Amino acid sequence: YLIGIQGPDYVLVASDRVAASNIVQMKDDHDKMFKMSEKILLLCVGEAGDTVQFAEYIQKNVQLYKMRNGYELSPTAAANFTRRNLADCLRSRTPYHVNLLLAGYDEHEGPALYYMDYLAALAKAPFAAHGYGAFLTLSILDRYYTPTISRERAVELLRKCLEELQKRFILNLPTFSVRIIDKNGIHDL
Amino acid sequence: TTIAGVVYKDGIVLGADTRATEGMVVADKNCSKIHFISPNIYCCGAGTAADTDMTTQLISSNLELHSLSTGRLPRVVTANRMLKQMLFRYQGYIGAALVLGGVDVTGPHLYSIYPHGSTDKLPYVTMGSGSLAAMAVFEDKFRPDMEEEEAKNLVSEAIAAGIFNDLGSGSNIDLCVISKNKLDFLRPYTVPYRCEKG
Amino acid sequence: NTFSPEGRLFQVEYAIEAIKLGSTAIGIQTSEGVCLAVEKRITSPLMEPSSIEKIVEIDAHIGCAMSGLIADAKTLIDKARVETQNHWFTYNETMTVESVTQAVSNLALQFGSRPFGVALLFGGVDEKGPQLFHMDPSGTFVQCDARAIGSASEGAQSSLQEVYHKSMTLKEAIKSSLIILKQVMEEKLNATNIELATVQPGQNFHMFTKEELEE
Amino acid sequence: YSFSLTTFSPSGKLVQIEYALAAVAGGAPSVGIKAANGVVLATEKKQKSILYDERSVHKVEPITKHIGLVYSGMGPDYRVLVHRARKLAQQYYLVYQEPIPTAQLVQRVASVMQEYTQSGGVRPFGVSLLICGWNEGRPYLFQSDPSGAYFAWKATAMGKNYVNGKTFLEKRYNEDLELEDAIHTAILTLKESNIEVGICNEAGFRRLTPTEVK
Amino acid sequence: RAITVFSPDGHLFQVEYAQEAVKKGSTAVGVRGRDIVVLGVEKKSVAKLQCALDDNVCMAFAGLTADARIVINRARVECQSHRLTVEDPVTVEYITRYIASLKQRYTQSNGRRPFGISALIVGFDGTPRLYQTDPSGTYHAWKANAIGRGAKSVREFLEKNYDDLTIKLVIKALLEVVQSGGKNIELAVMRRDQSLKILNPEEIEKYVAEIEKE
Amino acid sequence: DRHITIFSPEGRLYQVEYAFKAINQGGLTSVAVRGKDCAVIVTHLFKITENIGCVMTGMTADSRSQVQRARYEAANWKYKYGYEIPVDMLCKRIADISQVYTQNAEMRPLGCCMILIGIDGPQVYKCDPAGYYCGFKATAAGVKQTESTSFLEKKQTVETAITCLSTVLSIDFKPSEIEVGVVTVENPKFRILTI
Amino acid sequence: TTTLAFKFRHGVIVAADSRATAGAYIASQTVKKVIEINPYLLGTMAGGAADCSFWERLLARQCRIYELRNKERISVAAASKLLANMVYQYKGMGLSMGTMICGWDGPGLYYVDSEGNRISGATFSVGSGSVYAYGVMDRGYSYDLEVEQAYDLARRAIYQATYRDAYSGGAVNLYHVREDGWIRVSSDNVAD
Amino acid sequence: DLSASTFSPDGRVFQVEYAMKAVENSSTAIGIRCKDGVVFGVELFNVDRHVGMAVAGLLADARSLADIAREEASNFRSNFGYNIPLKHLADRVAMYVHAYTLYSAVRPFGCSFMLGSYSVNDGAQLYMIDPSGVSYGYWGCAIGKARQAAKTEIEKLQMKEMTCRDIVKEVAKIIYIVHAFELELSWVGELTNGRHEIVPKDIREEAEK
Amino acid sequence: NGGAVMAMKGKNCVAIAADRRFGIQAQMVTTDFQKIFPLYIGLAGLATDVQTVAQRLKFRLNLYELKEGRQIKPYTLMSMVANLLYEKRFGPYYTEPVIAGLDPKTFKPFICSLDDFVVSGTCQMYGMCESLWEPNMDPDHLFETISQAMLNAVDRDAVSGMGVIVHIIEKDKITT
Amino acid sequence: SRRYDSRTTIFSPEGRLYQVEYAMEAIGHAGTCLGILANDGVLLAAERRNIHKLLDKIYKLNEDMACSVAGITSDANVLTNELRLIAQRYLLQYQEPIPCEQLVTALCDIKQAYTQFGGKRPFGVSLLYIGWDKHYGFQLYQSDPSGNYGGWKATCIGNNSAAAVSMLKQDYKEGEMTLKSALALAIKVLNKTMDVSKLSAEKVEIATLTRENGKTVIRVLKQKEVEQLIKKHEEEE
C-alpha cells in the first residue's frame, strides 16, 4: 500500500514497510521508498524483483542525466520518462507489474505527485494511493481532503488513513514510513 | 458487406454497398470500398475493412510504380499475381478479401481473390457477407452476351439482394464500370427534438 | 600479415622489439617455490611508490609477471583469470600452469587487429610442484627454469647461466633475483625499486613486503 | 569497401564532387523555365548514328503525378537515381496520401545524393537534374546537383553551355510569360548551345506532344 | 584495415602521435592534497564573448576536449552501471581501469585511433587518489601530476617544491611558470563529501592576490 | 586514380571506358537488324527466356554472369507479375545492376555488350558496362563495330546482317562462323536460324 | 529443505537440515546446503537442489573474478546483489531457490529469493520447514546472545522444523560466521 | 593491373593472366573425348560417381574446386533427383570459378581442369574449365606445360571413331612423347558405366609399356 | 478502462468533446484525464495507448512541421495515424482516435475516426446524436447539441463521465 | 583493396588530424554569418550566398531553438535532420522541449564519431545554435567542425570570421544589450565584413529568436523590416 497527498508547499508520501511471500512476512523493514533525487521520489508496490529491477534502472538514468547535464529533472519529466519505459515493457516479453507513485517538487512548476499504472497510465494526482489497501483508503482521503491543508495537518490526515489498514483491512501493515518533500527536499517522518 | 463484379461484354461492372459495421452497430453509412488501385484497375474489398484498405494501398503504390516505370498501363493478371502472393504470405493474417477487376489490351479480367490467396477469374463474382444471396441472383440472372448498360440493371439488383436480405450489408449501391471505352465512378449511385440553446 | 621474404612475420618481430622498452624481469624457479621478480619500473618520483604494479595474481596458485607494453598486458591477464575460473567451474580442479599459459598463447596472434607486445611469466606451483612458464608474444609458451624477460634481460640471461643451480633453495633463489636486479638496473636497487612476489610450495601467492627485500 | 572516396583537399574542397561537377559539364544541354501557366523542361538528344530510338530513354521521366526530371551528366547514373526518386514519392503516397510536395521530393533526393559524398566505397552521382513541379498555386523549378545541393529557380539551364544559357534566361526572360511563350525562351536558349521536351501546367505532368513540339 | 600496426621501431605510430597531442592541451595540474584533492586547468583563451563522474570520482582531462567528453560519457555510463551491480558506488581506481581499458581498445581495433586525451582522473575513496591515464591505456597513480602544454615544466616545478596550501601549490605552479591569468585558471577543490566545487574568481583571490604578496 | 571507379578531373570514369575497350578486345563482331517482322542477330547466342535472347560480346567469362542474372530477373518477373518481361524492361534491369559495378569501387565493370532481341514489335536493345541502354534500329557491337555501323546507316533482313558481317569484317564466312538468331512476328520463340 | 540463518552480536549462524528428496522417496540425507563461496561469506540451498549448486557455482566464480580484479573482498551487499540480478534473469523459468548470503562485513544477512527478492533482515528461515523454524526462532532470538546460546537456538529451531516437515530430515549443520569467518560449528545429529 | 578489380588500360585484368600462368607451368593433363568415354590421363578426382576431373595448375587450390564440384553434383542430385549433366556442371563450377575474377579481395584460381562424364543421352562429354570461368566442350583437351605440344599428337589421333580401348593406351602414349613420368589414366566410358574410375592396373602397366 | 470521444461537425465550427475520467478497473482514478490533445485529436480506449499514440503522433507530426512550416492537412493526419496503427496489425494498440478540426485557411472542417459526427470510445452516442444533428449550427448551437449528446450518453454510461471538455474549433474563437 | 584507403581517421605526426584542419578551412569558403545574444533574445544574421537574380541557411530545430549552418549545404541538411530527430526524441520521452545545450552535445557526439572511427569523411560544417533553454534563458552555441561547442555571447562564422568576431570583441560590450543594440551591432559587423559598404535585402536575412509573449518564437525577419534596418544603415553610413 502507498499513499500520496499534494499540499500547499509540500508533497506528502508514505509507505507500508512490508513484503510477504507465503503466509508470513519475511521482513518488516522493507523500503518501498525508492528515493532517486533530492526531490524525485519513486514509491513502488509490486511483486518481486520487477519493482526494484525497474526502480534502479530508472534511478541510474535519472542520475546519469544529472551528471551528464549538470541539472536535475522535473517531477513531470522523470514521470514521463518512467511512463515511457512501462509502455515499452507492456508489449515486451517482460511486462513489469509495478504500481508506483512518482512524488516530486519542481520549484517553478510547484509540487506534483503522479499515479502510474503498471500498464503505464501516467496521471497527475491531487492525492493518490496504490496497492490493494487503495480500495479502502481513497475514500477517506477523498472525503477529508480539501484544497488547503498544512504539513502539520497532513500528519493527522495521514494518521487517520493508517487506521483503515489495521482496523478494517485483513493484512497487518504495522509501521508506516511517512516522508515529505518540500522546497527543502526530502525528510523522513 | 456485399461487393460484387460482373464481366460484361466490354469489361467489368464492379458494384459495392456503402456500409461498414463494427459488429452490430453501423459506424459508417457511407463507406468507400471500390478502391482505386489504378485508373485502369479497381479493387473492391470485404472482410476487415482495415486490411482491405491498407493492402489495397500497398498494391496501389506497387502497381502505380510498375506502370510509372514502363510507361505502359499495367495488366490485370499482374495485379492478380501480386495479390495472390500478398494474400498468401500472411497465411490468414490478411483475412480481408478482394475483388479485382481491370482491363488491359488483353481485355477484361475479374478475379475474386479469397484471403488465403486463390484468384479465380469468372464472369460473375460476389463476396462479402451478402455473397450467398447475391450469387444466387447473379447465377439466375447473368447471361453471357449481356450488353454494357444492362449490367447496371444486373449489379444494382444483385447488390440490392444483399442489401435487403442480409444484415451486415446495406445502404447505397456503388457501381463502377471498367471498360477501355470509358471509366465510371458513381460514388453514391443507387438508392434502394432540437436541444434548445442557451 | 606479410611473411617477410626471410620467413618470419614483421609485426611480431617489431613486437619483440617492443619488449626491449619493457621492464627487466627475472623469473626464478626454485624447486621449492616460485620467485617472480621485476624492476619497479618507476622513474617519476611523485608517481606513487606503492600503487604502481607489475605482477598480478591469476589464481591463488598462479602468479603472472608482465613486461613490454604494460597496458596491453591487462587484457590477456583478465582473460586468463576468466579462463582459470571457467576451468574451476567446469571441473572443480584448478587449471595447471601449462594450460593457463596455453590458453593465452591461443589468443596471441589472432589478428586477421595487431599483435600484443607483452612477455608474460606465469609462475604457478601445481601438483607437479614448481612450474614456470615464460610466454613469448609470438604465441609461443615454453617451460623454463630461469628466464629473465625484458630489456637488460639478455645480460640477466647470461648471468643466470653461471649461477643456475641443480635443485635450489627457496630463499637462496630469491637472493639471486635480489642481486641480479642490481646489475640489470641502472640505479642501485631499493625495495621501492623492485616488486617481488613469491610462492612457497605450501603457500598461496604473496606479494613481498619491502622490509624483507633489503635483506 | 567501407572507406569513402571523398576526402578534403588542403583548403577543404571535395575533389571528387568537383570532378562530378565536371561530369555535369558534359552531357547534352538541358533547360527549364517557370512561366506562370506551368514549367517546361527540354533537352538536346541526337540521332548520332541515325539508327537510334527517341522514345526509348527519355531524359524526361515523370516521377510522380506532377513532377518530372531532366538530367545532364552521365546517362547511366540517371536510370537508378530516378528509381529511388520514384521510391520516395510512392512511399510518401502510401504514408501521407497526397502526392509529395515538390520541395520535399527534391530535398529527400538531395539527401540520397549526399549520402555518397560521405559513404564508403562509392563515388558521388555525376548527374545533375532539374526537377520541375507544380503544387497548389505555384510552379516549382528545382536544380539538384552532384553534392546534393539543390536550389529552386525561376529559370535555369544545365549541361553543355549552361553558362550562356542562364545568361539568356535572365535577359531574354523575366517575370512571367504564358507557358508556350516561356517555352519560346526554352527553344531559343537551347538554340545557343532530336529534342525531347516535357511540360507541367496543371494537366497532369506531360510530355509536350510530338506534333505540337513541331 | 589495422590502423595502429607496429612500426619497424617497435613503437606504435598513432599512440606516440596521441602522446604529442595531449602536449598541445592545457596545463591540467593536479595534486592529491593530504586533506582533500585539488585539481585545475588553465588557458581558456578568454575572448570575453564566452568534470564529475560521481560524487566521489571526478576528472580533469587534458588533450583535445572534443574527444574528452566522448570518453567521459562512456565512463559515466560505466559508473552508474556499476552502482546498480555492486550496491556501493564505483571507486576511483575502477574508473581509471575502465577508462584505461577503453582507450587501449581503439589501438587494437579496425579503423579507430587512440583517444588523444590524457585524463587526470581524481577522486575520494576518503583518501585522495590522483591518477593519470595516457592514450596508450597505461594508468598510473600519482600524488602530483600535470599534463598539458608546459605542464611538464610544472611537474618539475612541483618536484623541487613537493586547504590554502594545496591551493597555493596549484596556483603557484601556474602563476609563476605559466602566464598569469586570473580567469584562465579554473581550480576546483573537491571537499570530502561535497561535490567537486569551483569557486568564483574573487574567492580564488585568496592566493591569486596573496601570490602577488609573495 | 584510374584504378578505383572515381571521376577523373575531366569528369570521366576511366574504368568504364576500359571496359568498352575490353569489349572491343573481346574480338567478336555482333550485328542485329530490326526488320518489321523479324529481328536478326548474328555473331554466344543465348536464350535468356524462351521469348527473349541476347548476345553478349566481350570477355567470355563475363558474359555468363550477366546471362545468369538475366535469366534470374526474367524468371523472377513472371514470378511476381506473370507475363513475359518486355525486352525493354529486361535491358533496363540488367543495365541497372551493371551500374552497381560502377557506383561501387569494390567490384569492376563486366565487359560484355548485351544486344537483346525479342518481340515485345521487334526490339534490338543495346547495353554497355556503363549502365546505358537504348533501343537501336540496327545495332552492332564488337571490333569492326564502327565499320559496320556505316553500312547499317546506309540501309532481306538476314541478308542485311550477313552481307554486313561479310563486307565489314571483309571475309567470306563458313556457316559455323556465323551463328544467327531470328525472332519472327509469328515466332516469338527465340530461335537460331540454322544460308 | 530448511536453512535458518540469524545474526547476533557474536556471529551469524546458518543451520541447515541435510535431507533431499524426489517424490516421497528420499534420495539422500547427506547434502550440506550451505554451499561455499568464500572463506568469510557463504551461501545456502533451498528450493530445487541443482539450481542452488549451479547458481552458487556461478556466484563463487563471479565473486572470485571480482576479488582478483577489484583486489578487495566482495561484500554481502554486493554478493547478494550480483546474485539477485543473476537469478532474476531466469525469472519465469522456474529456477527457484532460497539462497542466503551471510557473513561478517558488521554482520550481514541478506535473504535472496529466486524471483529476485533480495531483502535484508537479520532473522530468516528459508524453505518448506521455515514456517516451523520461524516460530521457535523468534522466541529465543535476541541480539544479546552468546555463541553457545545461539548454537542451541539454531539447533532447536532446526530440530523442531525437521520434526514436522516430511521432506526435511537429516542432521543440523551449523556454520558460524563470527568476526573472523565461518567454521563448521556443528554437524550434529537430529536422531539424538 | 596487380589488383583484380582494376583494369589495365588496354582491355584486360593482368591478375587473371598471372593466375592463368600457374597452369602453364604444371605438367600436362590430357583427356580425350572418344566414341564412348573420356579417358583422362595426367602425367583424378571422383567429382561424382558420374563425373571425373583431371586437374592442372597448382594442386592446393585444385582440390577446393574438386570439393565444390562434389557439392554441386550432390545438391543437384537432391533437388532434382537425376544425376547431374556435365553441360550444366561445367557451367556451374565455371561460374563459381568466374566470381573471383570480378572482385579485388579473392584471388583468381590457378587451376584449369577437364571434367568429363559419360552418360547415356549426352554420350561422352569432355569440358575443360579455365580459371577465368570459360568452359568449352572438346573432342580432346590437353593443358599444362606441354600445352600445344600435346595438342599436335591429340590432333594426330582421330578419335571420332577410335574406341575408348585404343585411347586408354594412347593417352599414356601422348604423355610419353611430350614427356621420369608417373602415369595416371582414367576410364569413364560405357564399359565403366559412367563410374569414374582409374584404369585397371594391368592395362595401366601395359600402357606405360 | 476506455473513455468516450464525442466529435461533431455542423458549420465551419468543428465540435469535439470528451469525458475526463479513466478507471483502474471499475474504480475511478482521476476526474481529470486529458484525451483531447491539440486541428485537434481525441483518443479514447486504453490510457496506455492514448498516451502512446499521442506521443508517437506528435513526434512524427513535428518532424513534418519543422520540415515544412506548412500546417498539416486533416486528411494527411488521418493517413498518418492510419498507417501508424496498422503497423501493429499483429500487436495492435487499442485506442480509437477521432481527429476534428479545420482544413488550413479554407476554414473547412474534417472529422474522422480510425479503427456529420463520429463518436467512438467505450460508448450510447451513435444512436443518440444522429437525428438531433442539424447540418447547420452556429457554435452557440453546436455547443448545445454536443453538450446534450455528451451528457446524456455518458451520464447513463457506467465507466465514463464526471467532467466534460468541449472544443468548438474556429479561427475566430475556440471555446471550452 | 584497402591499399587505396587514405584512412581519414589517422592521427598525424604533427599531432593534429588532417580532416579536422581541412574542415576548418572549408568554412572559410563558406559565406559570412553571425549570431548575437542579448538579455532578451538572440539574433542570427546570415548572408544569402549570392545575389543571383533568378534564384527565388537558418532552420527550425525547434520552436524554441534554431541553428545556423555555415560550412557547406549538402551536409548541413543531414545535420539539421539529425538535430530535429534528437530534439523530438528527447521531447518524445521526457516530455519537455530539449534544453538547447544538450541538443548541441548530441550532434557533436555524432560529428565526433566520424573523426574517431570508420574511415568516413567528417561533416565540415560549423554551426551556431540560437536558443532559449528553460534552465538558462537565451543562449547561443557554436559547433566547431570537429566536436566542440562554446557558449558564445556573440560570434561570427564563415568568411572573415576572424575580422568580424574580433571586431565584436570590443564592439560588443558585455551584459548591456537590449535587442535594439543587437540589431545595431549585427548590421554593423555584417556591413563591415563584405566589400559592399552596406548590404542589400538579398544579402541579409535575420532570424531573431524572441520570447514572444510567454511562447518563444523564432521568426525570419519580414523583408520590409530587413529593409528598414538596411535603410537605417544607409544613414548609419
User: Could you say which architecture CATH assigns to the domain J1-237?
Assistant: 4-Layer Sandwich (3.60)
What gap in Å lies between CA C160 and CA C175, rounded to an integer?
Answer: 12
- Domains of chain A in start order, with CATH, are 1-189 (3.60.20.10)
What gap in Å lies between CA F56 and CA A61, rounded to an integer?
Answer: 62
User: Any chain A CB within 8 A of the CB of G116?
Assistant: yes
End-to-end CA distance of chain I: 25
Q: Which chains border C (3 or more CB–CB pairs < 8 Å)? A: E, G
CATH of region G1-192, choose from 3.30.43.10, 3.30.1330.10, 3.60.70.12, 3.60.20.10: 3.60.20.10
Amino acid letter, residue G121: G
Contacts J157 to D, Cβ<8 Å: none
Contacts B197 to I, Cβ<8 Å: 140-141, 143-144
What gap in Å lies between CA C68 and CA C150, rounded to an integer?
Answer: 7
Q: How far is A163 from chain J (nearest CA, A)?
A: 38
- Domains of chain H in start order, with CATH, are 1-209 (3.60.20.10)
User: Does the beta-carbon distance from F22 to H133 stay under 8 Å?
Assistant: no
CA-wise closest residue to E173 among E196, E190, E141, E150: E150
B1-198 folds as Glutamine Phosphoribosylpyrophosphate, subunit 1, domain 1 (3.60.20)
User: Does the beta-carbon distance from I66 to J91 stay under 8 Å?
Assistant: no
User: Does the beta-carbon distance from F7 to D25 stay under 8 Å?
Assistant: no
Q: Where are the domains of chain I?
A: 1-176
Q: How far is E202 from chain A (nearest CA, A)?
A: 23
Residue of E13, E49, E74 best to disrupt the J interface, most CBs of J under 10 A: E49
Contacts A56 to E, Cβ<8 Å: 84
φ, ψ at J140 (rounded to 5°): -145, 135
What gap in Å lies between CA F111 and CA F25, rounded to an integer?
Answer: 10
What is the tally of structural domains in chain D?
1
Residues of J in CB contact (< 8 Å) with D are: 1-2, 4-8, 18-19, 22-29, 53-56, 72-75, 77-78, 81, 118-121, 123-124
Check contact F-H (3+ Cβ pairs < 8 Å). Answer: yes
- DSSP-derived 3-state class of residue B120: strand
What gap in Å lies between CA E53 and CA E195, rounded to an integer?
Answer: 10
J74-102 burial, b for 16+ CB within 10 Å, e for fewer? bbbbbbbbebbebbbebbbbbbebbbbbb
Who among D96, D101, D107 is closest to I79 (CB)? D96
User: Does the beta-carbon distance from A26 to G124 stay under 8 Å?
Assistant: yes
Which three three-digit cell numbers place residue H198?
A: 582409374
F137-165 burial, b for 16+ CB within 10 Å, e for fewer? bbbbbbbbbebbbebbeeeebbebbbebb
Contacts J84 to I, Cβ<8 Å: 63, 66-67
Contacts F106 to D, Cβ<8 Å: 1, 121
User: Does the beta-carbon distance from F132 to D126 stay under 8 Å?
Assistant: no
Which chain A residue is nearest to residue E78, measuring alpha carbons?
A64
Who among G91, G111, G116 is closest to A26 (CB)? G111
**CB of A77 closer than 8 Å to CB of A122:** no
Which three three-digit cell numbers place residue G49?
A: 537442489
User: Any chain H CB within 8 A of the CB of J170?
Assistant: no
Q: Residue E38 burial by CB count (10 A; 0-12/13-18/19+): exposed, middle or buried?
A: buried
User: Does the beta-carbon distance from B77 to F82 stay under 8 Å?
Assistant: yes
- Please spell the DSSP secondary structure of G37-98, one letter per residue: EETTEE----BSHHHHHHHHHHHHHHHHHHHHHT-SPPPHHHHHHHHHHHHHTTTTTT--BE
Query: Which residues of G define the annotated binding site?
Result: 49
H with J: how many residue pairs have Cβ under 8 Å apart? 5
| I1-176 placed in CATH 3.90.1410.10 | no
Sheet holding F41-42, edge to edge: F140-142, F29-32, F41-42, F180-182, F191-192
Give residues 4 to 63 of A whose Cβ lies within 8 Å of J: none
- DSSP-derived 3-state class of residue I154: helix
User: Does the beta-carbon distance from H134 to F24 stay under 8 Å?
Assistant: no
**CB of I33 closer than 8 Å to CB of A123:** yes
Q: Give the CA radius of gyration of chain F.
A: 16
DSSP-derived secondary structure letter, D147: T
| Number of other residues whose CB lies within 10 A of the CB of residue A177 | 17
Sheet holding D196-199, edge to edge: D155-158, D30-33, D40-43, D196-199
Technique used by the depositors: cryo-EM
DSSP-derived secondary structure letter, H101: G
Query: Which residues of G define the annotated binding site for bortezomib?
Result: 49
Q: How far is CA I10 from the centre of its chain?
A: 15
What gap in Å lies between CA J203 and CA J234, rounded to an integer?
Answer: 15
Q: Give the CA radius of gyration of chain J.
A: 18
Q: Which distant-in-sequence residues (6+ apart) come within 8 Å of G139 by Cβ? A: none
User: Does the beta-carbon distance from I59 to J91 stay under 8 Å?
Assistant: yes
Q: How far is CA H79 from the centre of its chain?
A: 25
Q: Which chains border F (3 or more CB–CB pairs < 8 Å)? A: B, D, H, J
Place of cell 576500359: F18
User: Does the beta-carbon distance from G77 to E94 stay under 8 Å?
Assistant: no
User: Any chain A CB within 8 A of the CB of G6?
Assistant: no
What gap in Å lies between CA D181 and CA D199, rounded to an integer?
Answer: 13
CA distances from C129 to E21, E46, F51 (A): 50, 67, 82
Query: Quick one: which H or E segment has residue C119?
Result: strand C119-124
Instruction: Residue D1: give the domain boundaries.
Output: 1-214
Residue of B62, B65, B81, B119 best to disrupt the F interface, most CBs of F under 10 A: B81
Find the CATH number of the domain harbouring F143: 3.60.20.10
A with J: how many residue pairs have Cβ under 8 Å apart? 19
CA distances from F170 to C51, E180, F164, F167, G9 (A): 90, 92, 9, 5, 114
Check contact A-E (3+ Cβ pairs < 8 Å). Answer: yes
Q: How far is F89 from chain B (nearest CA, A)?
A: 7
DSSP-derived secondary structure letter, B108: E
Handedness of CA J200, J201, J204, J209 (dihedral sign): positive
Check contact A-J (3+ Cβ pairs < 8 Å). Answer: yes
Which chain A residue is nearest to residue E81, measuring alpha carbons?
A60
Contacts E73 to A, Cβ<8 Å: 68
Contacts J93 to A, Cβ<8 Å: 80-81, 84
Contacts B68 to D, Cβ<8 Å: 62-63, 86, 90
Q: Helices I74-86 and B49-70 sit at what angle, rounded to 10 degrees?
A: 110
User: Any chain J CB within 8 A of the CB of A73?
Assistant: yes
User: Any chain I CB within 8 A of the CB of J189?
Assistant: no
Which three three-digit cell numbers place residue B18?
A: 456503402
Give residues 122 to 151 of J whose Cβ lies within 8 Å of A: 135
Helix %, strand %, coil % for chain B, to 5?
30, 30, 35
Contacts E81 to A, Cβ<8 Å: 60
Find the CATH number of the domain harbouring D16: 3.60.20.10
Helix residue ranges, H only, E37-91 = 65-85
Tell me the catalytic residues of B: 1
User: Does the beta-carbon distance from D96 to I76 stay under 8 Å?
Assistant: yes
Residue G30 among the catalytic residues = no
Find the CATH number of the domain harbouring C166: 3.60.20.10
φ, ψ at J232 (rounded to 5°): -70, -35
DSSP-derived secondary structure letter, D191: G
Helix %, strand %, coil % for chain A, to 5?
35, 30, 35
Positions of E strands within J73-148: 127-133, 137-143
- Domains of chain E in start order, with CATH, are 1-214 (3.60.20.10)
What is the tally of structural domains in chain F?
1
